Structure 1
Amino acid sequence: PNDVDPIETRDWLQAIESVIREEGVERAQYLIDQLLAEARKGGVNVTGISNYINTIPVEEQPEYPGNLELERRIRSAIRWNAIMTVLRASKKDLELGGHMASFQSSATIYDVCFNHFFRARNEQDGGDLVYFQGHISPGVYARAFLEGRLTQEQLDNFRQEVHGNGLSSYPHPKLMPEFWQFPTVSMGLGPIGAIYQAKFLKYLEHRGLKDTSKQTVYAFLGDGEMDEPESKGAITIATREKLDNLVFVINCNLQRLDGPVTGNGKIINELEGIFEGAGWNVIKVMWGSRWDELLRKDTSGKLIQLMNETVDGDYQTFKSKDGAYVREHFFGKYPETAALVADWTDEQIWALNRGGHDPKKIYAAFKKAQETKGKATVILAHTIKGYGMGDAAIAHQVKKMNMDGVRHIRDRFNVPVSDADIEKLPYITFPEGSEEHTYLHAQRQKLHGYLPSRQPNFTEKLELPSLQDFGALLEEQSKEISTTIAFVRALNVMLKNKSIKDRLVPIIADEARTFGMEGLFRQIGIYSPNGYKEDEKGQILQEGINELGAGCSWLAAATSYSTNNLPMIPFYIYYSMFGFQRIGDLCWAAGDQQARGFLIGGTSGRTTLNGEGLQHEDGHSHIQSLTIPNCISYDPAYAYEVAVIMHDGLERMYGEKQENVYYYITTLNENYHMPAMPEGAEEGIRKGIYKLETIEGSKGKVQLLGSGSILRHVREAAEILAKDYGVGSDVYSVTSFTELARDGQDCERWNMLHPLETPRVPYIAQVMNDAPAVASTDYMKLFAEQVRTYVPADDYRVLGTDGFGRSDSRENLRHHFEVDASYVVVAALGELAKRGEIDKKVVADAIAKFNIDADKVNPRLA
């Protein structure tokens, strides 16, 4: 059934509409409240889905300010050059790729925006921040080419960028650092990124750092992309934070890449339902003007009813057929709707357009979004998949020398290309002095220039804190502290520097007590403009149990140097396990977006977060973080190491070097003795390794390597080897095994490519010697094993925390994962026994002495 009686519904809905034509809105509200009060003999509820028609009626539609015929001519050239770019790439037969159908359905939506809404980077701000659909990139390139920002040479090298004279497949700032700004091709990451970008712009205004009030964040999405949990999972935040600077544009062509989104249902109703329930302003751009009279003149309301009941499947079927089909299967459903088009021709019925193809309907939506205050607006634009392409959407028949598809597109959009020149696949340009060239540039000049464009560096000079400004952290600690305590103290040092104090963006994902951040809460405050020192001037961003949301706030802050020419230094602290494992794709996009900030993997190490177990004990985030080329990962053991690493990071990224790199520092929740910094250790700390101590021993020599919480255990093992076994050692603090492996890989790559020159020696091979070595970390064996090739010793035994975590004491976990002092000693003696320096019985005896179960299951399999 699903309707019961739709004629009674028409009477009720026609009664409140007529009440609004009787000095309503105020009278309408009084009647609705008295109606709902009388629902005492019944029930009450929130879904509320409106009719399958335009939100903005013609009566309330603004006058279109542009020259529609000139705009149509410019748009056809953009359409043509976009198709030409992709077809020319296809002709190469190199499996390059590229989309055409996607931009064809949304071309008019982007066009209205470029001609009348998108603000480019200007003097006051970085303009509008547009999250373009990745797949419509040939459409952006085609417009940029007409604007004279891209050459024909670049279009001809679309998706051929290795040799530097080409264009990226999708928005990738790392590859095109002066053109693209926001990565969006990994679906779901654009909508959530845009939500926290809009929130960050409000933060900059409330904190009095930049007037961002004239900036709008546009997130252009497809209906299929909305299935990503990230796409709608954070939409209530826009309502909470009153983000009236955010606009979601959902292109509903009722399809994805393998058929429709919801055939048996109506994806536009699903989206309207959830977004309206989430407190957003929903604007549906359903039908074009060719439908306006039919709707106005229909007293029966049968057309609206027919429109409401027809599902996505039927609408897809309809646009795959002809006018004769629509007359029978759409309008033919009722005598009232059949009578409406009884005198219409099949061609006349087929001409009826979808809202997302009508500039007048599109403009009205973007204008009402611009006017809406207190909430974000979602624009649901109804378009046709592969619009004006004539079924073959198979237009790669050009390889078969078939231009019947190219001819149709030329005809459909009245493109000024002759039948003879069509095989050449030519680009169209508007010359200086033409109506189109003038108009194209005049509209963009009014809107402060060209979009997209990117500034790779910030203009101001920050007077950063010196290493000596961290002073106290470089000295021995009076009491036992952790590397997380060291991190918070380094923040306090930076919060004293006049130049960067108000630029620091500490971000926390709920649990602040765990990271001892509660001190900073009363000092700098928690940003809370809507709902203690929780106000709009608050500096800390508390994002709750939402790692992805916090990562998106971090990304907005870490790229503020480029987006708004306002360097912001973010510090996102969270449980290390829920970093790269949970928000990994965002960390890759952060690399692409050239993020410059700090990720702090708190409560790290498999054995250190001892009682939490399997889904919290992190012994592998460093294996995930090393996959990102511009991420610099450290695992410091001491407080002074934290200070040196944080200072260097700050200098590299926000100093004059302006290095497009971001930092990852794992910090701990365990307290132990924090010694003073050895004289001259600064270079070694930054590079990844330095000799801490040399312990004397007459019975043999070993090298012992450690990092994080496990270093003090390797150091303990060094004392045992010396006292009980007379084995001397070189003890090394490895601040970064990853940076040492990268340095090694670089030297060996160079040595391979320069056979006629003296080989370069990796930094680890410069610091270390030939003596048998043992390495132990709180991370899986591969973390320490990755430097093997570059370690100058014959034997290099690695101990690590491979296997699933479990709940126990730090002592029991360190014995289980075989990384404590007892296992470091047995590993060291074992090497010397192989070398014949000590008896095999000494190693045997040590296993028994240290209560080591030689036949327990491999911790990886446990």
Structure 2
Amino acid sequence: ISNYINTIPVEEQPEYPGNLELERRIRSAIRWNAIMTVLRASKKDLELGGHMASFQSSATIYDVCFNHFFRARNEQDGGDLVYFQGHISPGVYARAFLEGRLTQEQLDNFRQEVHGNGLSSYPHPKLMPEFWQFPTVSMGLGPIGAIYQAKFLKYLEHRGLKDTSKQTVYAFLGDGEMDEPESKGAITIATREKLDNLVFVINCNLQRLDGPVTGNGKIINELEGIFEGAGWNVIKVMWGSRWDELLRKDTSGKLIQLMNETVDGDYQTFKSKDGAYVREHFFGKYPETAALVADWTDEQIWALNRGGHDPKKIYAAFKKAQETKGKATVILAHTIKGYGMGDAAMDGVRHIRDRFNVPVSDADIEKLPYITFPEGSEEHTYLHAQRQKLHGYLPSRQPNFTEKLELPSLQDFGALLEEQSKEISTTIAFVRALNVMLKNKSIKDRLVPIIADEARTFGMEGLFRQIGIYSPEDEKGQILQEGINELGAGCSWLAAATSYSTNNLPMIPFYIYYSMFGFQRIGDLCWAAGDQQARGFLIGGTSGRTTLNGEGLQHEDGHSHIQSLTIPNCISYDPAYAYEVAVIMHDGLERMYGEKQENVYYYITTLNENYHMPAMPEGAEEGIRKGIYKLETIEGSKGKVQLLGSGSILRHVREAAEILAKDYGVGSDVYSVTSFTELARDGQDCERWNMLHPLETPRVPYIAQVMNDAPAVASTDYMKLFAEQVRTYVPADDYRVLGTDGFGRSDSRENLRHHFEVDASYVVVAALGELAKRGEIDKKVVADAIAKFNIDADKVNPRLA
């Protein structure tokens, strides 16, 4: 930690390049319009909400950036990638309005978007696809997302894919936000990868929502301490220009001592008081500090401001960051939350227009009028002129990429569509599919395989020697090894999955990891990715409750599909066979990066269990995409049932089919369900449409176009809800579901599938029971089956075990 003063002394401060007086005029107009936007919204009494105090504290920081640093998207690259602090959006909207990018009607529709001419509360690309770029309001995601975005830009340059050297990634963070583990938890990576294209700007107003971040301490010193120890360049912007002569003439060193020892709580106490109070409780602490202001009026003492409010100090910081290489820079900007709002922290708006010399008539204040600058005026010309020198306006977003990719056809995956002679797994199939893609001239180098330490577990060692590991193992390596860091790997995946938009450079990431540590562990990031319109593949390996058999309770995933189905634009599949993996990957590729450019991302669970992989049934492709298709029907004269399975359990459902036919003369229709979730969504969509068009021909759910009315049984390696979700749409009166509800445990696959009541034996007993209720077979046949299969009808429900 260093003294509690500016890192950059006046002698090293560069001359400010802009017109300070003009800038303030424009800035006061942006401040005013931001407050008018939120106040007008409140007057509606619709509980819309909105913030003002935060932007008031950081307005000048953003202003210096818009006038002198921020590069907009241009012909060469995506420009500077700015992660705006989420709740200061009114200020962003106010500047956009001033630049003529938004209308007054839009501002009057702040937080009222349903009808189409409004503005979102926060940065949400999904809601305003041509404006916002990075979703940051869920605190903590912005910092880590920015770290991996900066690292990805360097990756694109090192790989010879795009010269991103002129782009800088700015992450505007709150100080309270720095307590989120995700906020400082990965800062060490910025130093390992020398991210000198990354700048963290922390708004240190010393406050969060309920109170001071650390009243009894000094948050700025805490931040400096850990960032410095993590190897970052730290620049503190503590005090305004009025303090220079004071610090300059104090030869005793007491003013610094005093600044150092005063804690955050007392500093916040001063800003609530007045000049006389500061003379007494701060400077009055020591004779030498009291002597520095003896000649000052209380009004002059009260004028002393924090550094983050002085354009000259701010500029110095951003310019120095720009020059700093070999590591990332964090700017700790000292500010006042609620700055210039005074009291308010209908005549208090009067106070604001007085404080910022806002050009609003006093008999007009009542109408809460927006201020604009006419074309031809000093302000309008200056506003636009600075932006043009910086390539235009931001934030802005391009919804689609421009180039045309020559994607592999399904036949290019032809090997995976045939019967495999050796027993392999769906993960092995996934890797083989990747290799096919790695042979396509159009996308081979746009692929971005990502792993979190674990590569040997998924047998990815082969691609290693083939395409290498990224290590600026050299800077041309293609695979991103993020170590034991699922969140970091997910942010790398997100940066890659949205490159088509931010850089107009489509990249196709495949992040493979232990499924349990997917949505369950990084779900907030997965929701954010949906908002950011990510297009890529998330591969949940070692999936299924009973399949990763020895690992137990914290590894056995029997519910990730329940978590993924909550994300509207995530398309989830649980394939049992290699040919299904091939058809699903090809389709996703085509939907996301083909001419359609669909804004969806994929989640495919894969397995670590080897078994026989049959050839793809002729004509089964569309059924695989849609979610279900019939494998075969087995004959039998004593009854008929429908058996559905997915993932690793399908082969056991087929085994049940052979038993039912040969031991009981019960025939059946056997279906491979590649996506219960897509089938459920389709069914929900059909019934919604039907409800809304009562006079028209009812739409039939896709699952009902494949299944018939015979009693059905479904079994999967996930909790019952995964298959039970399509109940409404199944055209049979009987639909029994087996699943892996309950905490996992260590044992052999055979023992877990029996414990979780999902194996062939339970499918047979479940099927026989449906026939027995129909009076087709004797109930004792079901009872004798339970006995012969060694089923404990009275053991505790696995969910409670």
TM-score in terms of structure 2 length = 1.00
Secondary structure (helix, strand or coil) at the match of 2:66 reads helix
- Aligned residue for 2:771? 832
| Structure-2 separation of matches of 1:578 and 1:322 | 53
After superposition, the C-alpha distances for 1:556-580 in whole angstroms (9 at most, x for unaligned) are 0000000000000000000000000
2:184 & 2:637 partners in 1: Cα distance?
67
1:612 lines up with 2:561 in the alignment: no
**Residues 598-652 of structure 1: CA distance to partner in whole angstroms, max 9, x if unpaired?**
0000000000000000000000000000000000000000000000000000000
Equivalent residue for 2:742?
803
- In 2: Cα distance, 1:321 partner to 1:845 partner: 85
CA distance in 2, matches of 1:146, 1:793: 61
Match of 1:815 among 728, 751, 754: 754
Q: How far 1:90 moved relative to its partner?
A: 0.2
What does the per-residue CA deviation read over 1:390-427, in whole Å, with 9 as the maximum and x for residues that have no partner?
A: 1213xxxxxxxxx2210000000000001111010000
Question: What's the offset of the Cα at 1:742?
Answer: 0.1
* Secondary structure at the counterpart of residue 797 of structure 1: strand
SS at 1:379 equivalent: strand
What SS does the corresponding residue of 1:693 show, helix, strand or coil?
strand
Superposed displacement of residue 478, structure 1: 1.1
SS at match of 1:88: helix
Following the alignment from structure 1 to structure 2, what is the Cα–Cα distance between the partners of residues 329 and 667? 66
In the TM superposition, what is the alpha-carbon distance from 1:464 to its structure 2 partner? 0.1
Measure the CA separation in 1 of the matches of 2:275 and 2:631: 82
* TM-superposition CA deviations, 1:158-196 (whole Å, max 9, x none): 000000110000000000000000000000000000000
1:726-766 per-position Cα deviation (integer Å, ceiling 9, x unaligned): 00000000000000000000000000000001111000000
Alignment of 1:652-801 (within 5 A): 652-801=591-740
Distance 2:448 2:584 in 1: 18
Question: SS of the counterpart of 1:337?
Answer: helix
Say which SS state the counterpart of residue 587 (structure 2) adopts.
Answer: helix
Point out where structure 1 has 5 or more consecutive residues left out of the alignment: 1-48, 394-402
Q: Secondary structure at the match of 1:320?
A: coil
Q: Residues of 2 paired with 1:593 and 1:750: CA distance?
A: 28
Matched, 1:300 2:252: yes
Shift of 1:342: 1.0
Deviations 1:319-378 (A, max 9, x none): 111111111110000000001111211111000010000000000000000000000000
1:832 is paired with a residue of what secondary structure? helix
Indicate yes or no: 2:131 matched with 1:179.
yes
State the match for 1:55 in structure 2.
7
* C-alpha separation in 1, matches of 2:699 and 2:124: 34
Q: 2:422 pairs with 479, 482, 488, which one?
A: 479
1:510 CA drift (Å): 0.3
| CA offset digits 1:193-215 (Å, max 9, x no partner) | 00000000000000000000000
Superposed displacement of residue 511, structure 1: 1.1
1:107 aligns with 2:47: no
Partner Cα separation in structure 2 for residue 427 and residue 717 of structure 1: 72
Distance across 2 between alignment mates of 1:769 and 1:405: 70
Q: How does 1:325-340 map to 2 (within 5 A)?
A: 325-340=277-292
- Structure 1 runs of 4+ with >2 Å offset: none
Secondary structure at 2:641's aligned position in 1? Answer: strand
Question: Pairwise CA RMSD of aligned residues?
Answer: 0.4
Distance 1:404 1:51 in 2: 42
Cα distance in 1 for partners of 2:789, 2:16 equals 84
For 1:837 and 1:585, locate their aligned partners in 2 and report how far apart those are by CA, in whole Å: 50
1:254 deviation in Å? 0.4
| Partner SS, residue 752 of structure 1 | helix
Q: Distance in 1 between matches of 2:272 and 2:519?
A: 44
How far apart are residue 68 of structure 1 and its match? 0.3
CA–CA distance in structure 1, aligned partners of residues 40 and 618 of structure 2: 62
Q: 1:656-687 CA deviation, whole Å, 9 max, x = no partner?
A: 00000000000000000000000110010000
Deviations 1:679-734 (A, max 9, x none): 11001000000000000000000000000000000000000000000000000000
Distance, in Å, in 1 between the alignment partners of 2:675 and 2:86 is 36
What do the CA deviations read for 1:53-72 (whole angstroms, capped 9, x no partner)?
Answer: 00000000001000000100
Q: Secondary structure at the match of 1:103?
A: helix
Local SS of the residue matching 2:798: coil
Match of 1:312 in 2: 264
SS at match of 1:535: coil
What 5-or-longer segments of structure 2 have no aligned partner?
none
Q: What's the CA shift string for 1:420-448, capped at 9, x where partnerless?
A: 11010000000010000000000000000
Mapped partners of 2:517, 2:210: distance in 1:
32
Q: CA deviation at 1:381?
A: 0.1
Counterpart position of 2:785: 846
- SS of the residue corresponding to residue 672 of structure 2 reads strand
Offset at residue 389 of structure 1 (A)? 0.2
% same residue: 100
Query: Any idea what SS the aligned residue of 1:439 has?
Result: helix
CA distance in 2, matches of 1:767, 1:511: 39
Query: 1 CA distance for matches of 2:295 and 2:165?
Result: 53
Q: What is the CA–CA distance in structure 1 between the aligned matches of 2:343 and 2:783, rounded to whole Å?
A: 77
- The superposition leaves residues 140-173 of structure 1 with CA deviations (integer Å, 9 ceiling, x where unpaired) of 0000000000000100000000001100000000
Residue in 2 that maps onto 1:430: 373
Looking at structure 2, the residues matched to 789 and 337 of structure 1 have their Cα atoms a distance apart, in angstroms, of 78
For residue 237 of structure 2, what is the aligned residue in structure 1? 285
The C-alpha deviation readout for 1:494-530, integer Å capped at 9, x for no partner, is: 000000000000000001011110000000000001x
> What SS is found at the alignment partner of 1:251?
strand
> Any idea what the Cα deviations from partners look like across 1:521-561, whole Å, max 9, x if unmatched?
000000001xxxx0000000000000000000000000000
Report what 1:170 is aligned to: 122
SS in structure 2 opposite 1:478? coil
Q: What is the alpha-carbon distance in structure 2 between the residues aligned to residue 544 and residue 433 of structure 1?
A: 56
> Would you say how many aligned residue pairs link Structure 1 and Structure 2?
801
| Residue of structure 1 aligned with 2:176, choices 207, 224, 227 | 224
Q: Secondary structure at the match of 2:668?
A: strand
CA distances 1:47-88 after superposition (whole Å, capped 9, x unpaired): xx1000000000000010000001000000000000000000
1:285, distance to aligned residue in structure 2 (A): 0.1
Partner of 2:550: helix, strand, or coil? coil
Cα distance in 2 for partners of 1:116, 1:758 equals: 61
Inter-partner Cα distance in structure 2 for 1:384 and 1:165? 34
Per the alignment, in what secondary structure is the counterpart of residue 348 of structure 2? helix
Name the structure 2 match of 1:144.
96
CA distance in 2, matches of 1:444, 1:428: 20
Q: Secondary structure at the match of 1:718?
A: helix
- Aligned partner of 1:464 in structure 2 is 407
